Design a protein around this ligand. Sequence first.
Ligand SMILES: Nc1ncnc2c1ncn2[C@@H]1O[C@H](CSCC[C@H](N)C(=O)O)[C@@H](O)[C@H]1O
Lengths: 265, 265
Amino acid sequence: MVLYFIGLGLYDERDITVKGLEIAKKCDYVFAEFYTSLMAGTTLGRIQKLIGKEIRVLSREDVELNFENIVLPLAKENDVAFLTPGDPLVATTHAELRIRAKRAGVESYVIHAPSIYSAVGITGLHMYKFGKSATVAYPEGNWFPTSYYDVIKENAERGLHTLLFLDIKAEKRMYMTANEAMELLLKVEDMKKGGVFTDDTLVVVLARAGSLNPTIRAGYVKDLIREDFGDPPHILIVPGKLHIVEAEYLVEIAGAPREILRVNV
Amino acid sequence: MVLYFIGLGLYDERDITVKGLEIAKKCDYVFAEFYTSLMAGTTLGRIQKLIGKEIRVLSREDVELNFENIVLPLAKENDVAFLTPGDPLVATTHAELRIRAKRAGVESYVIHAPSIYSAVGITGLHMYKFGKSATVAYPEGNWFPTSYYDVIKENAERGLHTLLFLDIKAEKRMYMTANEAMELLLKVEDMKKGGVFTDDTLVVVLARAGSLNPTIRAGYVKDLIREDFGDPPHILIVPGKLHIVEAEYLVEIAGAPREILRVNV
Ligand SMILES: Nc1ncnc2c1ncn2[C@@H]1O[C@H](CSCC[C@H](N)C(=O)O)[C@@H](O)[C@H]1O
């Protein structure tokens, strides 16, 4: 009678950890959500085949409004698993589900799996230099979110990199590209004119991390805003002042302009 | 003609992803390093048996001085795997290794695995609120490094959490405890007098992340500094001002005192 929060990783169904797979295969009931992130290298079928169980997919409303009604009840008489893309507790509101489990009298365990928060390291940027993170959300109605712009500003001032998650509307199959993210930023730039993100700002694009051949590209906004980075999911990074070694990698591995090798210290 | 950087994960031999394991199996040669960090919950023996191949361990010098002599030569006519604890390239050094592969005309691919950078999410603290990170190193001789203290100040000043890696002497298999780290910080505070770390500061200790039974504890330094958090590895976190839901998780899941629901929110 326990509940397992198990991560499925970034791209493939094989991005789950061995530990996560052994445990999932022995659970009586398996649940999952696929709205917090996009797994572009697999299908629900392959995952089901991998763990050999039928997976009941839950929507954002099932989770946020009825997790303790749909999942926890069974978790008292059986071993239940809740699967999510990437790492199970990286979504802000997921950790709260453990509280719901407790109050319901159900013990829970967490099995980690690859997550962009860690996988960004493939960009070559020093992990310790990453500051506060943010998400670039789609504008809707008269509502135009801009908080993410200030996050970049605050970090850059301290010479820290900014990890930017791009928005996703799973039920509408809408996944923001790095290009769409850049456009929104150029706009907020005109709006706030703080000199944070312009055609000359250097950025890094990471698309489909977790796959064997992710797209890692670095360069100035003017030259990348129009570039094709392949299928989603996309993540966008606005680096702060670079260390020479970071620049070297970005140039040799992400095809960035040779000029960034000249750090203006 | 290919080199695979495969992450082994957090604690034991099952923390590697299924993808990582399968690829390691189909590789002709398998190397590994355990100088950047260790896998406290397993042994080279268990790992070797899981992969079903002999694993040649390389030292820091083997890698830093002769990686292109030991590893790359074989990767030109074979599929080679280089296993590392955690997630590859999160070590500030491994990134350049990809450049070396390129210089030697060897293509490289990265297979991710959970790292503390993402795993800290199990503390219930919002991932986006983590700022700059630091490592707490031991003072020795007439050298007393204290920059990690400064990092905390700057993060908390902006309401951000500080992830703190504790010193490790991999080859001597010695780990700094959270208790030791707390003691060092108080000593530093006693010199800097910045109000950054005191008996009343709220901290979070995460021990044996990746295990099914990790130790997650939150509370004031005065009460945690002599508490036994179990066997290493230990991770210390100094949270900034908390959102109510973060506080509730620390109380419900990490046993923090109710006092935090009014003092640190
Ligand atoms: N392989 C990948 N490449 C680029 N972005 C990714 C990604 N996997 C997830 N993301 C980003 O993460 C966002 C969801 S935020 C939750 C993150 C998730 N648990 C993780 O570990 O990554 C997505 O909208 C997407 O922009």
